[PDB]
Amino acid sequence: MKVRASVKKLCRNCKIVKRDGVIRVICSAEPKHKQRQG
Amino acid sequence: SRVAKAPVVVPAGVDVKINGQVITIKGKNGELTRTLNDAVEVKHADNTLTFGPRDGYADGWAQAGTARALLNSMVIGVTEGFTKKLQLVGVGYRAAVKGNVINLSLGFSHPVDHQLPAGITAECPTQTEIVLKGADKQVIGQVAADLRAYRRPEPYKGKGVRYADEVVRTKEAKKK
Amino acid sequence: AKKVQAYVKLQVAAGMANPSPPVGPALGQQGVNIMEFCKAFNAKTDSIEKGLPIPVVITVYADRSFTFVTKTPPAAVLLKKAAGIKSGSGKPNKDKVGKISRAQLQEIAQTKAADMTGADIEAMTRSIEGTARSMGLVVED
Amino acid sequence: DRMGANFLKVVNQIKTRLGANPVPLQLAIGAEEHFTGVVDLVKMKAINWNDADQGVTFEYEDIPADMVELANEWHQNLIESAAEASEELMEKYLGGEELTEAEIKGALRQRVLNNEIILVTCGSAFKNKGVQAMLDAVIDYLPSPVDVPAINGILDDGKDTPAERHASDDEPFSALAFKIATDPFVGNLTFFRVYSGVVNSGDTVLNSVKAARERFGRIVQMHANKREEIKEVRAGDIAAAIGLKDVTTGDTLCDPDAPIILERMEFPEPVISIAVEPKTKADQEK
RNA sequence: AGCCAGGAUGUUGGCUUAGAAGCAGCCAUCAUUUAAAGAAAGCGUAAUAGCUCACUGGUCGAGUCGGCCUGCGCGGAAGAU
């Protein structure tokens, strides 16, 4: 999970759910599109 | 809501034991009980079960919205069951069932034979296909996902242990 | 006719026996002997002077079967068969070269009227005027 | 002796990819780790191997009880393989004359001169399991230089008359030149094989395809590595036709006034081209 | 929002045609049928076969959706007996 202050909804099918409070964004086929902070 | 427009119809062959918050479902081949939270108002009204969110816990529409989906699965799981098949794609990798134990030909210097708990009648038609049978929807995944986590799908060959319906995304080397 | 299994209309000039690589996949969909589609159409291909893309459609069936529908060549390539060059659309509304009147357009529409139930005479007339303006062609009668 | 090593899969994979007709003979006993027996099906005997020794036992026993039916359904396909090899075994597959170990190979050996079936054998080289088994088929399923069509020298340019010469010692001498290695002792060396005839030591062996004269020096045999001087080369040995002045790929090694070959087929093309450069300017001289 | 569900089909959409064949990119950017379809969004990809968006055409049978303004909240937030 890459970390950066900006979670920008980047991939076309990008889920966003708030697990534990810190946002981590869920793609389907792209592992590269998953950030976690912010 | 959609969940409030979703009542569940218990059929004949599965008995409920409504001691208020604690419901123990006497079914076909097991006992699928869940001790829910106090954000629910349960009533097996006539035959079709009706539920309700308790006051104070107005977020119990969520907490019983779990429950409406829950008990529907329980009355159909204790009778019919889940076929949870896994596909072993590994070079020299086999699967064979004995009693309640599964072998794991997993490319190690030592064998891994793990015993599997109750609510499991496992089978193996061949070395690469493995049945799992169960009554709870949780236990039919939890014992399945532990095997898959021992050898995850490798996205350079397609190697690994993977589900029947799961479709991996294998890549290409592209350098050497 | 059929449904979500397969329906693509792709065939180009039938002087070439071997399936051209991009056409290949529309024959590479439901398991054909590619010699069969070469031997089906050549009994009627000897009634033409080759050079224009003639279209066929593919449509499939359960076991190993298939079927196909023969029509006439479309008027879009018939616009640029008479005009000499096969590709004229470089600038649509800035080129004024080349005239054919409506009388040529209806006699290449009777061969559509004797073949197909859509692509009717009077409705296609503005689109056979519409494929003229995109190519940069003029029309007068 | 490996995982995923199914014997019956691979021989029945040839009929799908290679498209050939293999009928295997020596089958498998053991679950690849406790593997002890190789199932020869003609004599219907399993062979014991070494506990872990580099080569003690050869103990033949019967078919074990754990494979009493797979030996049944596979032996009946072995004895099929002579009724459709020769036409004469067709009427005793069905009539029921006994298909012995010795009778069936007399048809199948003639099925190696046309090569429609190949003979397969499972076992281990490194675990010493099968190597002592694999030798007896070579004298009975691989052809001899006197059982084959021998040296066939055609002519030169006059007429196409292919002439089967004799495989014995009663012919003009004949050999071929291949695997022509080098050495810092004598220079050029060969790994040549003589098909028939006997040569003495010291001869005016020519190379009759390229019109050159050579003389036959001190011939040396090997254990693939060690110099052993072979003086008298008999018909069928493989040695080093030493001291050839010029020699090409596959020309004759033959006395004059004799039959003559002129044959070079499938000259290859080395494709990848890299340019070597010297280190010092004294190096490019060498 | 999901299961059935056609992805109605003129066309090869040029150019330059080697494939730039709706899926590389610049100019057009009409539509034969319009109760469902654009000379077009990605993946499959040299091109396409596979899978969709397009209208949800038929079922559920009620609410639902994208942004503007504020009350507060979370992440951002790592230091040295």
Side-chain angles (χ1 to χ4, degrees), chain D residues 90-186:
Chain D
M90 185 163 296
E91 57 262 56
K92 41 179 56 185
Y93 194 74
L94 55 91
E97 187 95 14
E98 48 259 12
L99 293 101
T100 73
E101 317 159 358
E103 209 285 334
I104 183 155
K105 309 176 58 148
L108 297 157
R109 168 65 158 210
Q110 284 213 340
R111 226 181 194 161
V112 199
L113 60 91
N114 53 3
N115 293 125
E116 292 296 314
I117 305 187
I118 65 166
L119 268 302
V120 201
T121 296
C122 52
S124 177
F126 174 64
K127 289 302 149 195
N128 311 68
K129 168 203 99 168
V131 178
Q132 198 87 299
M134 84 91 69
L135 53 92
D136 191 22
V138 192
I139 70 153
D140 274 327
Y141 298 91
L142 215 67
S144 197
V146 308
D147 294 63
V148 290
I151 43 167
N152 193 315
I154 329 278
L155 217 112
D156 31 85
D157 38 78
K159 230 228 80 49
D160 195 69
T161 81
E164 175 261 341
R165 319 169 47 187
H166 210 317
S168 185
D169 298 318
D170 53 5
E171 211 47 47
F173 200 55
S174 70
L176 217 57
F178 274 130
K179 300 83 173 154
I180 48 183
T182 52
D183 64 283
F185 315 112
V186 79

Side-chain angles (χ1 to χ4, degrees), chain C residues 3-4 7 9-10 12 20-23 25 29 55 87 89 91-92 118-120 123 126 134:
Chain C
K3 301 283 100 177
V4 77
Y7 202 93
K9 176 191 226 154
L10 179 51
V12 197
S20 179
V23 200
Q29 178 150 9
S87 177
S89 199
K91 285 300 261 193
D120 277 310
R126 63 178 175 86
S134 298

Side-chain angles (χ1 to χ4, degrees), chain B residues 21-140:
Chain B
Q21 276 276 113
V22 178
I23 280 182
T24 57
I25 300 167
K26 298 208 301 169
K28 187 143 303 184
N29 313 311
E31 190 75 27
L32 269 177
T33 177
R34 300 297 303 186
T35 42
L36 323 103
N37 216 26
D38 44 1
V40 74
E41 309 164 309
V42 197
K43 171 64 189 184
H44 175 205
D46 169 65
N47 295 318
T48 296
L49 266 82
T50 77
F51 311 113
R54 204 193 301 212
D55 312 320
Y57 308 103
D59 41 345
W61 289 72
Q63 299 176 272
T66 59
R68 298 221 171 182
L70 206 50
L71 177 138
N72 189 354
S73 64
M74 306 281 183
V75 296
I76 70 188
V78 62
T79 76
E80 280 302 315
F82 316 103
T83 289
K84 278 302 291 158
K85 206 78 175 290
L86 276 58
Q87 313 311 304
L88 176 53
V89 291
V91 279
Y93 277 21
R94 293 170 308 188
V97 49
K98 263 307 289 165
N100 58 277
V101 193
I102 314 297
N103 60 336
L104 272 196
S105 172
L106 256 295
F108 293 160
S109 310
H110 67 276
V112 193
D113 306 329
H114 173 49
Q115 323 275 305
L116 301 199
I120 305 166
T121 84
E123 295 97 46
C124 275
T126 171
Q127 51 176 251
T128 186
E129 272 201 354
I130 169 170
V131 195
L132 280 172
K133 305 300 293 185
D136 196 303
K137 197 169 272 298
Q138 171 261 5
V139 71
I140 204 61

Side-chain angles (χ1 to χ4, degrees), chain B residues 135-151:
Chain B
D136 196 303
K137 197 169 272 298
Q138 171 261 5
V139 71
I140 204 61
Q142 167 72 33
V143 80
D146 280 327
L147 266 73
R148 207 271 322 159
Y150 297 148
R151 184 67 64 191

